[PDB]
């Protein structure tokens, strides 16, 4: 099914011709345009008062990465490297060895935040909810190097943001 956007015949009677003459000479449609912008002048603006007010986000938001712990404090990551394998940007670099107590743990866990496309595949792939994209988006830096996260930075992010990260996972894990 189709419709014509612009296939109409102007009425050529004197009244219609004189109507178009009045529009040409008295700029009626241009004045009608002035009314629209005038009505917007008197509308409340849509602006929010950042940083005192923030745009709404959802629990699914993909922000800065973090490495999480179990309630006991043990790391969740067991160096399976599924995140590293799935990473579309190859932003993740992992090395692992047996820990001094025999645990399977990483000795290197780096995310190049300037390679990362913030896609969330890593946190989908992870079988133990170890790597997550947290809610933080306000972490711009003055140098390139500060955006090359090693494991200490990522564990610190997890300890810094775990209160919010856990609550967001609680809200969304039934959709996963």
């Amino acid at each position: 099914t189709y419709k014509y956007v612009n296939l109409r015949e102007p009425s050529m009677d004197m009244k219609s011709v004189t109507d178009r003459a009045a529009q040409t000479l008295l700029w009626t449609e241009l004045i009608r345009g002035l009314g629209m912008t005038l009505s917007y002048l008197f509308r409340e603006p849509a602006t929010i008062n950042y940083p005192f007010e923030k745009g709404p986000l959802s629990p699914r938001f993909r922000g800065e990465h973090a490495l999480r712990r179990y309630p006991s404090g043990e790391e969740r990551c067991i160096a399976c490297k599924l995140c590293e394998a799935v990473c579309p940007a190859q932003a993740i670099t992992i090395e692992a060895e047996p820990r001094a107590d025999g645990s399977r743990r990483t000795t290197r866990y780096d995310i190049d935040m300037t390679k990362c496309i913030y896609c969330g595949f890593c946190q989908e792939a992870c079988p133990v909810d170890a790597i997550v994209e947290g809610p933080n988006f306000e972490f711009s830096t003055e140098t390139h190097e500060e955006l090359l996260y090693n494991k200490e930075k990522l564990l610190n992010n997890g300890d810094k943001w775990e209160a919010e990260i856990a609550a967001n996972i609680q809200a969304d894990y039934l959709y996963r």
Partner: protein, 71 residues
């Protein structure tokens, strides 16, 4: 005929003008060529999906749909 070397992304237009009239338009593109098609050959089918968001990056989910239907 004056030649204008410059006249969504970034485009380089090389134009031939005869007064006000355009006599030739020669778009020079590739200023945003990033070898996506070659990169996709080093990705699994899932890893390649986010590349389609970044093509017509105003119509992200439609690009995703086209690739998903093909796969």
């Amino acid at each position: 005929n004056l030649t204008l070397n410059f006249g969504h992304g970034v485009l380089r237009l090389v134009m031939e003008l005869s007064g006000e009239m355009v006599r030739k338009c020669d778009p020079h593109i590739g200023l945003l060529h990033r070898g996506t098609e070659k990169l996709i050959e080093y990705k699994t089918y899932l890893q390649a999906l986010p590349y389609f968001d970044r093509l017509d990056y105003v119509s992200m989910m439609c690009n995703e749909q086209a690739y998903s239907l093909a796969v």
